[PDB]
Amino acid sequence: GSHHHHHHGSMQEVTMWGDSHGVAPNQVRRTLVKVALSESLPPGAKQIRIGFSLPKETEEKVTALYLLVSDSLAVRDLPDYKGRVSYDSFPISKEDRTTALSADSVAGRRFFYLAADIGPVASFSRSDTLTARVEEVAVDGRPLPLKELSPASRRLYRGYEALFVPGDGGSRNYRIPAILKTANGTLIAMADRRKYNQTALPEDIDIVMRRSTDGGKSWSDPRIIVQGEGRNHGFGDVALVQTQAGKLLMIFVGGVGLWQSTPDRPQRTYISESRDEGLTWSPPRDITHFIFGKDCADPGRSRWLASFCASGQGLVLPSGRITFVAAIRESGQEYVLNNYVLYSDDEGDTWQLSDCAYRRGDEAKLSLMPDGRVLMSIRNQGRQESRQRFFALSSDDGLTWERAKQFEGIHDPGCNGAMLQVKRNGRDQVLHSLPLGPDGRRDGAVYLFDHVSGRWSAPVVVNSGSSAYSDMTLLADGTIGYFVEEGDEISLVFIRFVLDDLFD
Ligand SMILES: CC(=O)N[C@H]1[C@H]([C@H](O)[C@H](O)CO)O[C@@](O)(C(=O)O)C[C@@H]1O
Ligand SMILES: OC[C@H]1O[C@@H](O)[C@H](O)[C@@H](O)[C@H]1O
């Protein structure tokens, strides 16, 4: 083996991880450091003592400390599992730097969490972070060597909440975030309820929703709004808009996998609408026949094989035209997709396709430029060219398109993300979310593109660690809501900040 293992007895081993998830004011029992024993305390043990450090700046930002003890080693803060992780909580005075528990209280468990209640105050700047470190773990007065696998650094954000966590509602997994703010200020968050594992269609998947009427301060209990009925009969990959008339529209796919779809046995595209801020939804309406396949009235598209609109949000233009970008498979001989805008000029009654917007594209998103042109951002699938994100422009409200290399300048490891058109210090800019990578789904970042100089900012990492799809919306009061896939086993996390918190 990699290490020498002695033969004079069993050797307890201690591992510790500092936490780097975001936090927000007033949150309860937030993990700062996690400690794992490799085996239970031995039967003759009487006490475990844990010594720790915590800088004054962090002490001033917390109201209470705790040692939590669990039989489970969890990725996220223990309250995020809503009781599915059982734990005991042992208070520590916030000024103390050591704590001890009897072996009987530990009751054979191996996992310890130095946790804190967060106070009401914060500056939210890049440097507004919380940290602690475990300095000693001693059993019956004998210290153990500690294996430190990560430092603690929890950034304070104006809002931070995991809205969908593995296990919630009985679903094993969650993926594929979509966020919408309505004109009345309601927030709708939807996701794939990946009930049996984290894999895509053709797995059996439901679509689930939560809604907030207070700007993300609190969220309704999750509701399954489309229920998968078995393998090859699931639904997922939601994108959302609100039409000019005010109805909410969700578009999604269901059925076999994208590469298994054929003209005669398609993976289908459906729409559903809500006229009451997301409280109720119409039965899914199949609109596949407007796009491709054996029921399509355009014979030039009746042999195309598959289509899916990119999850997250579409775009409703000032004219009222409703748009989403579809990525369409035109040939069964190649694993290649071409982008077309799927649009409706009659509030969703009928749907049409633009001319082709991008060859060898993938999930693509739209945003409205200051002058009325439409910018499209296209995922780079298959490490094409210089592994950069691709862009295109339309000046006819999405009907025709031309590649826009001047907008390129950020890496795309091959992942969905989102755009917001913003004004900052009097300058029109585009905010774009993507994982930084490089070449992996790590370090969820945002960048600003300055329209006038044609240059991208350095990235700002919002959520370090494993990070994948992201969606973003602008709230009424000027904050940005950023809804991201955090972790290798994904939770969908809603983070609220203003631009100056990240870029100033
Ligand atoms: C309908 C569908 O399959 N959507 C899936 C897409 C497409 O397969 C790729 O974008 C095609 O290249 O990719 C994911 O798997 C991914 O990369 O995390 C997630 C998503 O659920
Ligand atoms: O070092 C030994 C001593 O240390 C204590 O902390 C421990 O609980 C007892 O076993 C005692 O005998």
Numbering used by the authors: 20 to 523
From the manuscript:
The oral bacterium Porphyromonas gingivalis, a “keystone” pathogen of periodontitis, produces a dual domain sialidase (PG0352). Biochemical analyses reveal that PG0352 can desialylate human serum and complement factors and thus protect bacteria from serum killing. Structural analyses show that PG0352 contains a N-terminal carbohydrate-binding module (CBM) and a C-terminal sialidase domain that exhibits a canonical six-bladed β-propeller sialidase fold with each blade composed of 3–4 antiparallel β-strands. Structural and functional analyses further demonstrate that the CBM binds to carbohydrates and serum glycoproteins.
To probe how PG0352 interacts with native glycans, we engineered a D219A mutation in PG0352 to inhibit the ability of the enzyme to hydrolyze the glycosidic bond. We subsequently co-crystallized D219A PG0352 with 3’-sialyllactose (3’-SL) and 6’-sialyllactose (6’-SL) and solved their structures utilizing molecular replacement methods to 1.42Å and 1.41Å, respectively. The overall architectures of the CBM and sialidase domains are completely conserved in the structures. In each structure, the sugar ring of the sialic acid moiety adopts a distorted-boat conformation, with shifts in the positions of the O2, O6, and C7 hydroxyl group of ~0.5Å when compared to DANA, due to the D219A substitution. Otherwise, the residues and interactions involved in the binding of the terminal sialic acid moiety in the PG0352:3’-SL and PG0352:6’-SL structures are essentially identical to that observed for the binding of Neu5Ac in the PG0352:Neu5Ac structure. Three additional ordered water molecules are observed in the active site. One ordered water occupies the space vacated by the Asp-219 side chain, coordinating the O2 atom to the main chain amide of Ala-219 and the side chain of Arg-194. The other two ordered waters are part of an interaction network that connects the carboxylate of sialic acid to the side chains of Trp-278, Arg-398, and Gln-400. There is no clear electron density within the PG0352:3’-SL or PG0352:6’-SL crystal structures to facilitate the modeling of the galactose or glucose moieties. The absence of electron density for these moieties suggests that there are no specific interactions between PG0352 and glycan substrates at the active site, except for the terminal sialic acid.
